[PDB]
Design a protein around this ligand. Structure first.
Ligand SMILES: C[C@H](O)[C@H](O)C1=Nc2c(nc(N)[nH]c2=O)NC1
Ligand SMILES: C[C@H](O)[C@H](O)C1=Nc2c(nc(N)[nH]c2=O)NC1
Lengths: 346, 354
């Protein structure tokens, strides 16, 4: 019995714009994870979204603000011509053409709508607790529909008082499309949305360690920013994952310095690129200290320097071995089936 | 054929508190207007609500911010522990116990949720255009579910582009609570919140000049304002006659020769003109918004030029031309529960499926 799934993406931005964060990696990988087992998976996402191979349906409208831009007492916002609202209205309309509906939005409304749907609606939470309304909505969903919530990390699960009631699936990626290369060259990678404050700001600043360039990937937003330390910093634009990975794989190490998934680490490993992260949040469950990467104290600009000088120690083939050992699609396949299948009956 | 209805109140505040606004009068009245015609009506409302003779279930939560205090580009807010969201969740729980659910809340969420219900949801919009997100929600609802949206006035409909596709049910009240009084005292009425920038100094000035003392009705939050009113006018000029209730209002109001109605906002539908007619009171109102379709000019009242003393003074000196018996007959004819019942049935019975 092959089942039919509908994935409703994040409303902060179009899939494959770079603006939807880590959902743009996880959504297609978890989709591919089920299609490989003979399931049908169809995606619904904001207008402007791109997705190879997969039945996609898009809807135009106003993007949802970022959640890490609002307090804890701040309410859920539904602006005019909300894309989120129209995404869900749309899912509701076709609910009977599907066996289950998985939501990837870190948003109140999808959770709230769960009992209003006849088709079972499972939810994959992507961030820690940020809002009171959001935690209350996840909790209400659990209470009525147990097992229907999931998470990637336990450090994510632990920010919730209902934390132990959420499943863990962790995170995967399509290993086949990442080429592991030994050829390293003194470069250094960094991969994300190049925001006003993501880790430049203040992680390039620790690229001085051996005056190393820091080749920067990521979708460039429309506004400007720019020059401190006079311009040894090799740049890149957005580009597909396959162009990313060739350009990335040939780094000596990848840096991560977010404020606190973050399933970028996991891409670097798939190329045998050792990760230097802050010993904080997600990275701790991905990186194995002084083996696949370094996990240093946050906010030093000194610890990182040292970490970057110790890269040659780490076996690059080991990084690639971990990535395969844990983070395959085939394993994430089973874990999704041991999450969703039971909800088709309960 | 009788049916079962579920009425879901406003999330701005409890019923029986003053915070729910005109829903505090509309909801019971429309409810009563169906029960006195065979139907059953239940009510869902926020924690604290007081509502007699009618099955009431109350719901805990944060109240919803009044829509008029937000601008047009502002989003819809759903706060943590929202009474609004919990109301509509509870309604959906019991949806199969009723033939139709009628929403009284001026908010995005109940409108968005209409296709998500198997039981028909009808919406009584209570204010004029305020937001982009609310206007589009009603618009969407109109398209998919024509005949689903009702309004109190054409003046309020006129604020929306799609106003022509809304139904005007007007308004009603329980006439038996209001005593017709054909012989009033030499006094004038004014009803509403006692604060600055609310129309009262206009009504005091025009009353005094006319040679009649004014009697007032409503909430006084700032005593310094009241003493300041006495300072610059007269101790005789204006007289507190209590808060509003409804039985105290119809007692005290019927005794006046006229209601001076001098509001600022571009409506004030505003129940009070209807209630004044119920006691056989002629209304002297500003010629704008709701009263333009309430008062028949020169027969049940006078519609006058806004913010102008001479215009009130002239209307006051023509109150005696107006038959108080007529004021009552138009309240009986246009604003009765009996009359609202057919309109509600004209509107809601076609919306029933099965
Ligand atoms: C990966 C993560 O889900 C993504 O970066 C974000 N998603 C969301 C967000 N904010 C909201 N309101 N909703 C989301 O789904 N901010 C960031
Ligand atoms: C009758 C009048 O419309 C009522 O007092 C109000 N209701 C509401 C309001 N604001 C919102 N958001 N919702 C309501 O139902 N402001 C005033």
């Amino acid at each position: 019995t092959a089942h039919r799934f509908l994935f409703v993406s994040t409303p902060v931005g179009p899939l494959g714009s770079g603006r939807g964060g880590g959902v743009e990696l996880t959504l297609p990988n978890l989709a591919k994870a089920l299609t490989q087992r003979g399931h049908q998976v169809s995606v619904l996402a904001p207008a402007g979204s791109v997705l190879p191979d997969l039945p996609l349906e898009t809807v135009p409208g106003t993007w949802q603000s970022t959640a890490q831009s609002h307090g804890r007492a701040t309410p859920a916002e539904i602006p005019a011509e909300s894309v989120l609202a129209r995404l869900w209205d749309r899912a509701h309309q076709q609910q009977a053409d599907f066996d289950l509906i998985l939501n990837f939005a870190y948003d109140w409304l999808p959770l709230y709508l769960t009992p209003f749907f006849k088709t079972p609606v499972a939810h994959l939470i992507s961030m820690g607790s940020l809002s009171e309304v959001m935690d209350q909505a996840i909790a209400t969903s659990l209470d009525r529909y147990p097992g229907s919530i999931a998470v990637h990390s336990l450090a994510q699960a632990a920010t919730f008082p209902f934390g132990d009631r959420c499943l863990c699936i962790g995170n995967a990626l399509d290993l086949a499309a990442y080429g592991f290369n030994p050829e390293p060259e003194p470069v250094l990678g960094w991969v994300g949305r190049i925001a006003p404050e993501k880790g430049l700001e203040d992680a390039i600043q620790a690229a001085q360690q051996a005056g190393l360039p820091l080749r920067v990937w990521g979708a460039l937003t429309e506004p400007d920013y720019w020059q401190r330390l006079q311009r040894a910093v090799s740049y890149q634009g957005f580009v597909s994952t396959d162009e990313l990975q060739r350009g990335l794989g040939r780094c000596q190490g990848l840096l991560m310095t977010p404020k606190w998934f973050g399933n970028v680490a996991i891409e670097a490993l798939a190329c045998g690129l050792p990760v230097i992260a802050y010993a904080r949040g997600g990275p701790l469950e991905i990186i194995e200290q002084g083996k696949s990467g370094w996990l240093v104290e946050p906010d030093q600009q000194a610890a990182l320097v040292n970490a970057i000088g110790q890269l040659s120690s780490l076996d690059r083939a080991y990084c690639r071995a971990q990535a395969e050992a844990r983070f395959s699609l085939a394993a994430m396949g089973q874990r999704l089936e041991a999450w969703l299948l039971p909800l088709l009956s309960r």
